[PDB]
């Protein structure tokens, strides 16, 4: 009669590493690193993303003619750009504090695109709806959808006087621009005076703008420039616009609703009807493992990123058949 | 001491082997395997809980004249990634070393338990097996694993047999 004691041996060839030994063979192992992903832009907690596609934040917020379809969107979980998102400011110029606007928009869960000033009866003494060839639509000149270009009427340009009182229960993102013609001829032809000013004032905002006339290199075919500005009205606040000229007046603004867990990502993946908890530019992640080596960028409860190629851990005996 | 593992055993991590006049085969030890499984599961829970979730780490844009801030943000991102990559790899090495030592300790503890039970009624051999000086049937074998090996019920009769050596 004989009895003996030993341990399990297996015909599986997992290998692991320790402090003193490398490539140690173990009967069982568990991988702590995820490297597989869905490969598609999925839905996050039941809400589809804002797939900007052709255009980017600047074009989406100014409403340039190439992505007019986005104007019906009201709620989202994350904003998705694409590598070929080139359509932004169709008219050349500097979008001032652009990266601050992107950071502010990175926390919005929805908004209401409403009409601050009505084009029909808010500017009765000025010509409304100028057009440019830099923002062509269907081969015909057009302009931004959320901004209104104002111009003289009957050979005169009276002083602007309009103001808006925020009776909405939320912050209103107001957008406008100041035009900087290329030469004095364009300034006279459009506004009828060489020296003009634009003053925008609120309970916590106060700034004055003046045109600058110079010859500039042609960008997108125009020697002029429009500098785009923005501010956030606090609930109950009032904003006043005064201008002797050179005003690309606001037309539509956004009553913003804040949120958590949003962000802006650049992705090439396609859309699908699946749901997910974690999303990366590469695709969704469907595992609860502690680590990840797919992409540093994350939206939602994603596993932590590490540069490792393998993080197996030993959960079994040593294999010595 | 033990000359490798067993490929014949299917159930359990640590097990016994026996052959006598009425059978042969293997049998696992449930008490030891379950405790080991609890230990490993505890480690798995510890590693998952002590590591936080990357709730949201989207990128950031900087202006032409803000390259100092861009490099500072890049430095922060790279520095945290390097620290967490180092922590993850070192943690894996530490848990692997502890787990493998844990398995070795468990086998040795059971080996000592068998020794204490038999108490020199069998001739211990280097390969780790115990060869008895007495007859030990299935009831005797089962008692060894169950922890109810009655010493005098097998010791006295083996005195002459051992002395004959």
């Amino acid at each position: 009669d004989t009895i003996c004691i030993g341990y399990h041996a297996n015909n599986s060839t997992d290998t692991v590493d320790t402090v003193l030994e490398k490539n140690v063979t173990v009967t069982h192992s568990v991988n702590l690193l995820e490297d597989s992903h869905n490969g598609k832009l999925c839905r996050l907690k039941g809400i589809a993303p804002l797939q900007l596609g052709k255009c980017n934040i600047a074009g989406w917020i100014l409403g340039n003619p190439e992505c007019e379809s986005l104007l019906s969107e009201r709620s989202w979980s994350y904003i998705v750009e694409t590598p070929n998102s080139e359509n932004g400011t169709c008219f050349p110029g500097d979008f001032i504090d652009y990266e601050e606007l992107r950071e502010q928009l990175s926390s919005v869960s929805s908004f209401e695109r409403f009409e601050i000033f009505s084009k029909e009866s808010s500017w009765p003494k000025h010509t409304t709806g100028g057009v440019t060839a830099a923002c062509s639509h269907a081969g015909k000149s057009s302009f931004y959808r959320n901004l209104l270009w104002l111009t003289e009427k009957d050979g005169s340009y009276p002083n602007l006087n309009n103001s808006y009182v925020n009776k909405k229960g939320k912050e209103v993102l107001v957008l406008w621009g100041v035009h900087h013609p290329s030469n004095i001829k364009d300034q006279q032809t459009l506004y009828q005076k060489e020296n003009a000013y634009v003053s925008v004032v609120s309970s916590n905002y106060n700034r004055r703008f003046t045109p600058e006339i110079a010859e500039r290199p042609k960008v997108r075919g125009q020697a002029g420039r429009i500098n785009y500005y923005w501010t956030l009205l606090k609930p109950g606040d009032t904003i006043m616009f005064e201008a002797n000229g050179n005003l690309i007046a606001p037309w539509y603004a956004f009553a913003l609703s804040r949120g958590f867990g949003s962000g802006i990502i650049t992705s090439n993946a396609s859309m699908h009807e699946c749901d997910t908890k974690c999303q990366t530019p590469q695709g969704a992640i469907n595992s609860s493992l502690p680590f990840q080596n797919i992409h540093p960028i994350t939206i939602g409860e994603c596993p932590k990123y590490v540069r490792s190629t393998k993080l197996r851990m030993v959960t079994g005996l040593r294999n010595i058949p | 001491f033990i000359e490798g593992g067993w490929t014949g055993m299917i159930d359990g991590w640590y097990g016994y082997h026996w052959q006598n006049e009425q059978g042969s085969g293997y049998a696992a030890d449930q008490k030891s395997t379950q405790n080991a499984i609890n230990g490993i599961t505890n480690i798995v829970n510890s590693v998952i809980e002590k590591m936080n979730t990357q709730f949201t780490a989207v990128g950031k844009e900087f202006n032409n004249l803000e390259k100092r801030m861009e490099n500072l943000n890049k430095k922060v991102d790279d520095g945290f990634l390097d620290i967490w990559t180092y922590n993850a790899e070192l943690l894996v090495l530490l848990i692997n070393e502890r787990t493998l030592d844990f398995h070795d300790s468990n086998v040795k503890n059971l080996y000592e338990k068998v020794k204490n039970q038999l108490r020199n009624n069998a001739k211990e051999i280097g390969n780790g097996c115990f060869e008895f000086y007495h007859k030990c049937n299935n009831e005797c074998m089962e008692s060894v694993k169950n922890g109810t090996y009655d010493y005098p019920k097998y010791s006295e009769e083996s005195k002459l047999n051992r002395e004959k050596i």
Partner: nanobody, 99 residues
Framework: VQLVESVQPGGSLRLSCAASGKYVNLMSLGWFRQAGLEAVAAISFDGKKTYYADSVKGRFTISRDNSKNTLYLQMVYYC???????????????WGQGT
């Protein structure tokens, strides 16, 4: 760590088990029955592999899928999870309420 789960002279009856407790998704699951306690079937994580008892004879395809981290068994019974990808009775530590 927990699991929740939920006969005639003919046909087969389907039953399902759902993961419960902290991140059970990372653990393998198996099914057991008692008249003694014995294993029936197990499935590894991500459905890599399946094991069955002698009585199965390869029938009763098990699967697990998205909805509530459930697994189904079809052509008292309890389910348990283990961290080891084996059907061994010894590797199961967390058990359901039985049905």
């Amino acid at each position: 760590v927990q699991l929740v789960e939920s006969v005639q002279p003919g046909g087969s009856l389907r039953l399902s088990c759902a993961a419960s407790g902290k991140y059970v998704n990372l653990m393998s699951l198996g099914w057991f029955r008692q008249a003694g306690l014995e294993a029936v079937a197990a499935i590894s994580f991500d459905g890599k592999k399946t094991y069955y008892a002698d009585s199965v004879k390869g029938r009763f395809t098990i699967s697990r899928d998205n909805s509530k981290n459930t697994l189904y068994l079809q052509m008292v019974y309890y389910c348990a999870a283990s961290v080891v990808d084996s059907l061994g009775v010894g590797f199961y530590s967390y058990w359901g309420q039985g049905t």
